[PDB]
Symmetry: C2
Subunit: 341 residues, 2 copies
């Protein structure tokens, strides 16, 4: 098992608007969109992209600005749906086949080819890629092996090499990386040790280093980062958290971590002064939440945070000059469809 998951996938669109993707009681993917590229923008309200999903639905933006949403189907295949033109209409759901046992994890290669990662029936990591930039057809599936006990997460190195992180059977953080950008050449799995009780979250720093966040054995927030040299040790950011963490960059590149606390309110800790700076003490953004928070930077360079409420609606709070906005409701009824819990 893992700390309570994020309930939505969120993206900044090609035209600077937040769009969120979640799952209803009907197992359909639902979609909510800012009208305008600004903090406090009116929202579309929830509309259905349909389908029937047995994972968290994960949106990624193609290098041509077209959104594409990936989800496990009821047949355990990888399914996807995409915009046919930038911020226009959607395709039908189409199958990329395979059998997967995790939420999908997506990144664009430096050549614009999307590559999707998911656990398989053998509990190994499997991957499939676009054969050409922002387009089908897709490659055959293949395995990157290993044995994983969490949803996988992928990011890109500052040199364009994809890198995947996942919990192993010993509950350590393990990783594997491309040896060259755009490559089918990968490293062996390597252990970053520690003991993690959440899905790992990965982000690139202002200075092009991967930094990984996860809940530890002691239910504190831990992190570890790249220094072609080795990783740091695991370091505690303290706190006591009851969900997966979420991490986003402020527009000045200061990292900021969010998680549900023991009082089921939203808590956050941030780098102070600069992206090189020391982390703040944990502070409360209130609310009562029934999901991990989901954090994203909007087109005004402000953080916005989404979480499911006691009513199972999605609620939203954002940064102001002085503080954070009171929680507002975007309505809907959201379920946690995470293929791993």
């Amino acid at each position: 098992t893992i700390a309570l998951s994020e309930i939505v996938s969120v993206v900044n669109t090609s035209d600077g608007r937040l769009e969120v993707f979640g799952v209803g009681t009907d197992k359909a993917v639902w979609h909510n969109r800012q009208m305008a590229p600004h903090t406090g923008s009116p929202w579309s309200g929830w509309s259905s992209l349909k389908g029937q999903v047995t994972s968290k639905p994960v949106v990624y933006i193609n290098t041509d600005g077209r959104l594409e949403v990936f989800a496990r189907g009821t047949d355990n295949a990888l399914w996807h749906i995409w915009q046919t033109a930038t911020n226009a209409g959607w395709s039908n759901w189409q199958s990329l086949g395979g059998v997967i046992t995790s939420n999908p994890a997506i990144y664009a290669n430096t050549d614009g080819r999307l590559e999707v990662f998911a656990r398989g029936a053998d509990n190994a990591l499997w991957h499939i890629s676009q054969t050409t930039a922002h387009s089908g057809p897709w490659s055959s599936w293949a395995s990157l092996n290993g044995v994983i006990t969490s949803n996988p997460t992928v990011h890109i190195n500052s040199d364009g090499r994809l890198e995947v992180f996942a919990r192993g059977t010993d509950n350590a953080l393990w990783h594997i990386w491309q040896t060259a950008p755009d490559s089918n050449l990968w490293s062996s799995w390597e252990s970053l040790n520690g003991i993690i009780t959440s899905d790992p979250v990965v982000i690139d720093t202002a200075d092009g280093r991967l930094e990984v966040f996860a809940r530890g054995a002691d239910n504190a927030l831990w992190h570890i980062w790249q220094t072609s040299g080795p990783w740091s040790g695991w370091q505690s950011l303290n706190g006591v958290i009851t969900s997966a963490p979420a991490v986003a960059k402020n527009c000045d590149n200061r990292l900021e971590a969010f998680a549900r606390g023991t009082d089921n309110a939203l808590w956050h800790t941030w780098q102070t002064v600069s992206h090189s700076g020391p982390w703040s003490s944990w502070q409360s953004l209130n609310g009562v939440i029934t999901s991990a928070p989901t954090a994203v930077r909007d087109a005004d360079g402000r953080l916005e945070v989404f979480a499911r409420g006691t009513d199972n609606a999605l609620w939203l709070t954002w940064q102001t000059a002085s503080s954070w906005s009171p929680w507002i409701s975007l309505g809907g009824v959201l379920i946690d469809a995470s293929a791993i819990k």
Copy 2:
């Protein structure tokens, strides 16, 4: 002729540091680098990448994070030099041949292929591209036709289509665009009218629109922007400017324009409140400058501005909480090698 040009090309590196590229009295390309990814970082001082250039040297970052610098040689061919690995050593200067009569203009296609644009001996626009992502070999040269009287500038649409802007023989702003991302299919040249007395500067807004800035017949700063619909009219931002303009985005996405005034000090006007906001009155950042300013956002989300001084050194001022830093000198002796003046 055109308003006085920018004297350096600047890039934010894969690890968040500013690096500047200019030309010495010897016609070699010289290089200055921040040590650390922060405002007010110590600088390397000027070191030579050698070569012999008859244009402004233009740096672009490959999708694998490798810097690549393009310049006209003494033989009027396009030449380039690149990092062999991300923020490591440089290749030798190599020729991409052709005969060009402008500074080169560079963008990455959505598939990671760099595409270079330059005026030819026939005064038409010519282009050459990497055949695969972030790598040689390069295509054959070909022409996109037209007749141009300024350095060309290229940007990417929010849908991944490259678009090139240049002054025509009637002194209007003209443009041409890819009809599909990564394509060799281009539109006809079209006129955006107006009368411009500087190279055009192009930037993408927070909401994914191209916005073009240029000095007008009245030596005011003018701009025009995308609304698949038509462009705005030309609108004046007033001022009286004696150089090319420079434009950069604040970390909250507010556009900010810089130019030399009649008193040969640096002047700037900025969007207020938000990226949707009205433009400020022009205000002075002092100094006495012998080049257009060059503006870039650093890894702390602050604007830094470079300009040649009366001593022909490069000087530097940046945003603070309240105001801007006093001008400091980064030394060197820089010449304006712009292939068009």
